[PDB]
Each structure stands twice: as structure tokens, then as C-alpha cells.
Design a protein around this ligand. Structure first.
Ligand SMILES: CC(=C/C=C/C(C)=C/C(=O)O)/C=C1\CCCC(C2CC2)=C1CCC(C)C
Ligand SMILES: CC(=C/C=C/C(C)=C/C(=O)O)/C=C1\CCCC(C2CC2)=C1CCC(C)C
Lengths: 11, 214, 214, 11
């Protein structure tokens, strides 16, 4: 869950 | 222990140089991407485990965005300036059925920020305090988040009193807008969930993700 | 200008020396009568016009009562002590379907008050700040209420720092429990309105009056 | 409206 947020925080 | 207001101000300046509801929801989605970039610029946020970074942003995004568009609108008469460059006038909000919450934002947040001339550093610190919310459920290490929050308000108070020595109650006045921000934040979420339920009113992917459970 | 913490402490000491939900609602009604006596003892409250005294109490009664039973329970393990002399254990609340909000009270309020050893003077001042809520709609003179609030937190800060010199962030820590109090307060009202709607769960006259419109 | 509260504050 929360695909977008994780991707943005990691990058 | 390492939480300079200068870095917080930089984070603020770094991210920000016919149904009004639809425009509001579009601006919200747009700003969620920018909110992530803002948080990454707040000292120590990125050093927290990824899972806690997610929890903190999911817990405070609505209050964080409301604080931002409210302060941005201090120069506006009876309206709000959206990040998209669009303006929503009080009359427009009222004619869309969202006059009650709109008025709360203007009266409890915008007018008060304007009256005390809240500056960007103070705004930045208040948002950093909201970000570092130790009460967020699921935090792997709440004490750590609480420590960061404490460092932020310690720096904020130092900034005040030094910048506004003649206003001893300024620091407290700033913190005392947080209950209003919390209440308004909750009401805005209620509206969003209703819009999602009723259908209509387009809701983009990031905003929609924030409405996911929990 | 005339808002001694001693008078606020006196106000506190003056008013306070199988469905758990029903017991909670009964204690709430009982305490509403006592809340009026408490407020009358807060410096300058009685000097405000009657209509504004009504507005302030109707706007803050739920948060005022929650703060009180939360502080009263600091000595209690995993439960809350009601004004009626009855104890509600976490397990009891959970088995009644109100475990979620109960846990928020224990975690966000009781545990935090216990951990920082919030004293009665501090509790009294925080309630006086909540009482003097300048954002309450309908106030004939909001500036006057705001002035009283400012005098309360000015006195509270002086009390802290003098009483707890070794804890510079104590004053801010106290004010920072207000957002939690506001959120919990709102959720409790939602529960009350649902209980009233569903019927069952007796609701006495004063508590019922507080649920009247607005 | 608010009968009880008014009576208590006035007395
Ligand atoms: C949660 C949130 C976020 C706003 C983000 C923006 C608009 C950022 C920006 O541009 O800088 C605000 C919402 C959500 C849906 C419910 C309502 C209101 C029912 C429309 C509002 C807007 C809150 C004020 C303007 C009244
Ligand atoms: C608004 C209010 C007031 C409590 C007053 C008391 C109990 C004073 C006292 O004795 O000193 C609290 C309520 C209301 C209905 C909804 C719920 C909860 C759904 C039961 C609670 C209780 C709040 C905590 C204990 C969980």
C-alpha cells in the first residue's frame, strides 16, 4: 500500500 | 541539537517561490508531490526509517497543506490563493456549498496569520512541528519523533524573542493556532471522504492514495 | 493584568477533592454542573456577558471535562477514574465497542500527563486556556476573550520555568497537548451524537442540552 | 434555548 509516497520518499 | 531555523526557512523557500472544489482537489494533489520534497529538506526527517516517514506524512499532510495555502493567502482579501495560480473567492466557495469550512480557514487561520504578521520562518517551524507528530500511530520509535519536535519548538522560541523581543507571548500565540489547524484539518478530510463517496469531483492518484486505509 | 495561577489552582481544588458507556455519560452530566462552578471561579470569566459565558462553555465543555478525567487518572494503570467514583478499565471499554477512543485518551493524554508529571496548576491553566477560546463563534467581543487567554498563558509560562527551571521546553510541551485534546474532543462528540441517534444509552438533561443546536 | 446553562450561570 501507499505506492506513490514510498517511491517519492525513496528516490 | 542540530535544528537551525535557517534550514527550515530554506525548505519553505525551496518549495514555494467552474466548481472551486475540483480546483481545490487538483491543487491538493499537485502539492502532495511538493510536500514530499519539502519534508526531505527538513533536518533529520530523511534519516528516519522509511516506514516512519510514510506514517508522519500520511498523518499530517492535510494540516501541512492547509497551513501553507492559508499563509500564502494573507495578502488576499476574502479568498484563498491555490498553488495552481488560481484564486477561490469566499463568494465562490459559498456558492459551491463549502462556505462554512472556507470561513473557518479565513477566520481561524488566514486572518490570524495576517494580524500577527506570521513570517515564513515561523510558518516553516509550525509545519515542522506538525510533521514531527509523536502521536502518529504505528511509529517504530515515537520518542525519536518527539525529540525532533522538541528541537523544532526550542529553535522556534529562540527565533521569536530574538526577532520579536517586544512580543513575549508570540511563541505561545503561534503554538495556539495548532488546535484550530487540527480541527480544520479533520473537517477538510470529512469533506474529501464525502466527495469520494458521492463520486463526481475528480480526485487524482496521490490525493486518492492519502484517502486509502488506514 | 490580574490572572494569578493561585486563583486557577484554587478553582481546581474547589471543584474536585454494566455498559461503561452509560456510566461515562452519567458522569459527564454530573460534571457539567460542576464545570459551571469551576468556570465561575476562573478570574474574569463571570465578568463577561452572560451570552459569551454560555458560548465559551458550550464550545469547550467536552475538552474541559476530558482534560479533567484524564489528569485524575494518572495514578490509574490502564483505566479511567470517573467523577462518580467508578473506574473504567481498558478491557471494559474495549468490550463495549469504544476501545479505539479509550486508547487515544490513555496514550495521547493520560500517559503524557503522567510522564511529565503535569501538576494541578498546569492542568488548571490549560483548561482556562481552552475555556477562553477566542475562536468560538458568536462571541460579542472575541478580542476580550483572546486577551484573557493571553493572560493565562503568560502566567502559566511564568509558573513554569520558576517551578521547573530545569525544563525549558515544559511550557511548550503543555500547550502541545492541546491539538490532541481538540481531536479527541471532536471524536467523543461524534460518539455522543451517535448514541443519541441510536437511542438506548440514557443521556441526562444537561448533557442532552449540550447536544442541542448549534 | 440552553435553559439549564443560563440558569446555572446567572444564579
Ligand atoms: C485537505 C485540503 C488540502 C488543500 C490543498 C491545497 C489547495 C494546496 C494549495 O493549493 O497550496 C483542503 C481541502 C480538501 C477537500 C475539502 C476542502 C474544502 C471543502 C472544499 C479543502 C479546502 C480547504 C479550504 C480552502 C476551504
Ligand atoms: C465528552 C465526554 C465527557 C466525559 C465526562 C466525564 C466522564 C467526566 C468525569 O467523569 O469526570 C466523554 C465521552 C462522551 C461520550 C463518548 C465517550 C467514549 C465513547 C465512550 C466519552 C468518554 C471518553 C473516554 C473516557 C474514552
Amino acid at each position: 500500500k501507499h505506492k506513490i509516497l514510498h517511491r517519492l520518499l525513496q528516490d | 541539537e542540530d535544528m537551525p531555523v535557517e534550514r527550515i526557512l530554506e525548505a519553505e523557500l525551496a518549495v514555494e517561490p467552474n466548481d472551486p472544489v475540483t480546483n481545490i482537489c487538483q491543487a491538493a494533489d499537485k502539492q502532495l508531490f511538493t510536500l514530499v520534497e519539502w519534508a526531505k529538506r527538513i533536518p533529520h526527517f530523511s534519516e528516519l526509517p522509511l516506514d516512519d516517514q510514510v506514517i508522519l506524512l500520511r498523518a499530517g499532510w492535510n494540516e501541512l497543506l492547509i497551513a501553507s495555502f492559508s499563509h500564502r493567502s494573507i495578502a488576499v482579501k476574502d479568498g484563498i490563493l491555490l498553488a495552481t495560480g488560481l484564486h477561490v473567492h469566499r463568494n465562490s466557495a459559498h456558492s459551491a456549498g463549502v462556505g462554512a469550512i472556507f470561513d473557518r480557514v479565513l477566520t481561524e487561520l488566514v486572518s490570524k496569520m495576517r494580524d500577527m504578521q506570521m513570517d515564513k520562518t515561523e510558518l516553516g517551524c509550525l509545519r515542522a512541528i506538525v510533521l514531527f507528530n509523536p502521536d502518529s500511530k504505528g511509529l517504530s520509535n515515537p520518542a525519536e519523533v518527539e525529540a525532533l519536535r522538541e528541537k523544532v519548538y526550542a529553535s522556534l522560541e529562540a527565533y521569536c524573542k530574538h526577532k520579536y523581543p517586544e512580543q513575549p507571548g508570540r511563541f505561545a500565540k503561534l503554538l495556539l493556532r495548532l488546535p484550530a489547524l487540527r480541527s480544520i484539518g479533520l473537517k477538510c478530510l470529512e469533506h474529501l471522504f464525502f466527495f469520494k463517496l458521492i463520486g463526481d469531483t475528480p480526485i487524482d492518484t496521490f490525493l486518492m492514495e492519502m484517502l486509502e486505509a488506514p
